[PDB]
């Protein structure tokens, strides 16, 4: 809690499709949306 702590961590990044949905009084946007993600490959521990 006193000395600064160090550790090796993985870089993380985010990806989105250019799909934007919201809610507002009088808006022209539908309110219910659905999508899916299928996981093809995952290396549980590529690093430590």
């Amino acid at each position: 809690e006193l000395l600064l702590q160090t550790n090796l961590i993985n870089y993380v990044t985010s990806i989105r499709p250019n799909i934007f949905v919201g809610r507002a009084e009088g808006s022209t946007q539908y309110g219910k949306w659905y999508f899916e993600v299928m996981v093809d490959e995952v290396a549980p521990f590529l690093t430590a």
Binding site: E1, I19, G22, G26, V39, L46
Partner: protein, 806 residues
């Protein structure tokens, strides 16, 4: 992270199909793993923005977005009522995968630096036409009111048949049958009334926007010619459109702009009417479901539809002009956008401080991929991140959007660049000068001097710096690969300038002005804010008082101020299951801690929020109120409902002084301080508040191990604003006892040197990683969806500040 029950639980593995459902009405976010329900939901979260699907990851994955339609075939049926996400692509956009708020990109000859991304708002989908009801038509306009009612419909039918649309009993776009191509007067009653209303509405909007109209011809106005449409343009039912024929008119540019505004207004009115009827937007048209590809505010509409609407309105304006009505365009009302804070908006990239040069002749290049607000030049090592480049004495830069040179202000210089132009910045510290070249040609001031800046004091040195505005892209070439420089040999090489990073074994590190607000200690020299550490007297506890230095004077800075205390209080790992002098046993066995905030008389209680914040608070909201606080409920139950837990998560636990100001005292300035006390039970997770001794109705519940920082948000209304009083109460320990281990049993209030007041700062310098993850995004197919791949690992050594959880 909260564990969530689901059949056959397992961390996401290959051949797993996650299904995400967003219901903005509740609001709620629910999941489904391989078709099986996930017994947990997010709900009751903030809705002041646009939601997008997202996947976060480290290296070593391959995944595919399935968005429905031709952008990934769903493996499972969407729950009833939910629309596929591929329907949400805007009319002027193409579906594809993106990074989020990137400041860096790859490009043909190296990395590109990217300025802030200009993003839409949830309020950008609310059509907002101008009010046209009270605009009663003056006599001549009322006379012409229904005259356009027929003519516009005639033009509409004629345009349909010219593009090939031939009347039919019903709506069948394939064989092209359409029911509304019948005489306007006999057109179906609803559509005829709508057309009458719009024909009047064009004039009503002309007046509403401020246009000046007046009759100019009577006999020539009456003189009218129609169009003799042949059998090709005659209908299946035989009706012949008879639109007004007149081509003897021209259009002024102001009139074209007014045509654009009229088209915008008309489309927005139509969109509002359809929204009221219950329609919504969809990339794919669905009439039975009241989904329409055009149901979006005009600004976001596609170019072709804009042109069509503008053509119609332009024809109407031509009719009026030919009739002679002097439609003087309304006096343009000057206005700006000011969408954001200019000082904090443009992203600044500078070389690291260790690279500062204090001698020699140095050169580097900056290609402007875009043509917007970009600045490039030389900055001092102590460059601030929240000030525009060259607005102070810490940077000598060139802004080639309009051709200005910036240092302690702006001045015309050089010429604006174009896309692809390379600005060569040169600094000569032997002569103390700065030179700018555009595409190899030196830029000269209006006077005629070759140098941009002169008599430059060396000081601590200079660093390459650039600033990109929202939506701008640049390419910074510091010259490590001397062959990469494009205009060095033409200008600078013979003059003896040396590429900034010529003899460097590795690329130069850069830092960028990250716009994530962070709490930093109040500067000891701050022009406007002063914090005084008052000692504890016999009848007063230790205090930290804030005073506005420059109150009630010109140059005064009055704006929201977010303050916290440097150290947190941490709730216990496990919560308990289920005179005015302290009693030793009670005080030594208690786990409740207290601290007060004294809002000084003069400081309006309605402009002060008192409470706690977690390490996660990062909002520099200039219009803050308790409705802006982040909040979300995570609810977990069994298969057949049976909610098992419902936890509320937030980062700001505060109360409003307006809750305590009394209605009698409301509307007048009070002459008494307001003391808001905050109590936290570190063993039960309960947080309560008191006002002037009396208890308040607000109470919060947190989870074990939670870290809370004492905090106060205030809009200064007086030279004395607030005072953190780190005192105690009967049988209640002071804050120091919870903050400091050595004082865990000491009931004497203390304010050690570490405990200090910190304020929220909107921008801070942040190091740019030298290597970035290589993410490959592509379209696997029409049924496979969109593939994201990342296979190369990448790590860093992180330094963790334990108290800030950062």
């Amino acid at each position: 992270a909260r564990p969530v029950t689901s059949p056959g639980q397992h961390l996401l593995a290959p051949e797993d199909v996650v299904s995400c459902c967003l219901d903005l009405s509740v609001p709620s976010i629910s999941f489904r793993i391989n078709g099986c329900p996930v017994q947990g939901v997010f709900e009751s979260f903030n809705l002041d923005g646009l939601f997008f699907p997202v996947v976060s990851f480290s290296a070593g994955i391959k995944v595919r977005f399935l968005l429905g339609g031709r952008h990934g075939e769903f493996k499972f049926l969407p729950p009833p009522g939910y629309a596929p996400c591929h329907e949400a692509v805007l009319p002027r956009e193409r579906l594809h995968l993106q990074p989020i708020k990137e400041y860096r990109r790859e490009g043909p000859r190296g990395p590109h630096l990217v300025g802030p991304s200009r993003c839409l708002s949830h309020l950008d989908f609310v059509p907002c036409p101008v009010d046209t009801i009270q605009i009663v038509l003056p006599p001549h306009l009322e006379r012409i009111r229904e005259k356009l009612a027929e003519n516009i419909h005639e033009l509409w039918a004629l345009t349909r048949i010219e593009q090939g649309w031939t009347y039919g009993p019903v709506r069948d776009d394939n064989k092209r049958l359409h029911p509304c191509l019948v005489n306007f007067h006999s057109l179906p009653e609803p559509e005829r009334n709508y057309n009458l209303q719009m024909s009047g509405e064009t004039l009503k909007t002309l007046l509403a926007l401020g246009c000046h109209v007046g009759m100019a011809d009577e006999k020539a106005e009456d003189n009218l010619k129609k169009t003799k449409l042949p059998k090709t343009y005659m209908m299946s039912n035989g009706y012949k459109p008879a639109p007004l024929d007149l081509s003897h008119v021209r259009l002024t540019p102001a009139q074209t702009t007014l045509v654009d505004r009229l088209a915008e207004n008309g489309h927005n009115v139509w969109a509002r009417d359809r929204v009221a009827q219950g329609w919504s937007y969809s990339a794919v048209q669905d009439i039975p479901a009241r989904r329409n590809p055009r149901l979006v505010p005009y600004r976001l509409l596609d170019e072709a539809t804009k042109r069509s609407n503008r053509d119609s309105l332009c024809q109407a304006v031509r009719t009026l002009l030919g009739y002679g009505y002097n439609i003087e365009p309304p006096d343009q009302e000057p206005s700006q956008v000011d969408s954001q804070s200019r000082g904090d908006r443009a992203r600044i990239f500078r070389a690291e401080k260790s690279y500062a040069v204090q001698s020699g002749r140095w050169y580097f290049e900056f290609e402007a991929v875009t043509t917007g607000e970009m600045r490039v030049g030389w900055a001092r090592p102590e460059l601030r991140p929240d000030v525009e480049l060259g607005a102070d004495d810490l940077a000598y830069v060139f802004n080639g959007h309009r051709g200005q040179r910036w240092h302690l202000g702006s001045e015309p210089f050089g010429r604006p660049w174009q896309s692809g132009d390379v600005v060569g910045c040169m600094i000569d510290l032997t002569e103390n000068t700065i030179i700018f070249t555009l595409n190899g040609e030196v830029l000269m001031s209006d006077s005629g001097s070759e140098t941009a800046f002169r008599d430059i004091e060396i000081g601590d040195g200079f660093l390459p710096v650039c600033s990109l505005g929202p939506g701008q892209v640049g390419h910074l070439n510091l010259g490590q690969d001397v062959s990469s420089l494009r205009f060095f040999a033409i200008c600078g090489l013979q003059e003896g300038f040396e590429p900034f990073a010529i003899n460097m074994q590795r690329p130069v590190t850069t830092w960028f002005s990250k716009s994530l607000p962070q709490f930093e200690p109040v500067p000891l020299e701050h022009p406007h804010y002063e914090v005084a550490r008052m000692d504890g007297t016999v009848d007063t506890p230790p205090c930290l008082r804030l005073t506005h230095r420059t109150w009630g004077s010109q140059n005064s800075l009055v704006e929201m101020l977010f303050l916290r205390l440097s150290l947190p209080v941490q709730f216990h790992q496990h919560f308990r299951c289920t005179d005015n002098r302290d009693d030793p046993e009670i005080i030594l066995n208690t786990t409740t801690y207290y601290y007060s905030v004294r809002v000084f008389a003069g400081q309006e209680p309605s402009c002060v929020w008192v409470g706690w914040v977690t390490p996660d608070y990062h909002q520099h909201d200039m219009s803050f109120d308790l409705s802006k606080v982040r909040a979300v409920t995570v609810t977990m139950g069994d298969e057949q409902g049976n909610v098992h837990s419902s936890l509320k998560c937030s980062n700001c636990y505060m109360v409003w002084g307006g809750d305590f100001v009394s209605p009698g005292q409301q509307g007048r300035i009070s002459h008494t301080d307001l003391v808001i006390g905050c109590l936290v039970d570190l063993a039960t997770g309960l947080m309560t508040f008191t006002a002037n001794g009396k208890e308040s109705n607000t109470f919060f519940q947190v989870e074990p191990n939670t870290k809370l920082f004492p905090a106060v948000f205030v809009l200064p209304t007086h030279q004395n604003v607030v005072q953190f009083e780190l005192g105690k109460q009967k049988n209640i320990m002071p804050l120091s006892a919870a903050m400091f281990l050595s004082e865990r049993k000491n009931p004497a209030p203390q304010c050690p040197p570490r405990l200090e007041v910190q304020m929220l700062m909107p921008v801070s310098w942040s190091r740019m990683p030298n290597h970035f993850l290589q993410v490959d995004t592509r379209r696997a197919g029409e049924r496979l969806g969109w593939a994201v791949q990342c296979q190369e690992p990448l790590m860093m050594m992180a330094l963790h500040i334990p108290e800030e959880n950062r």
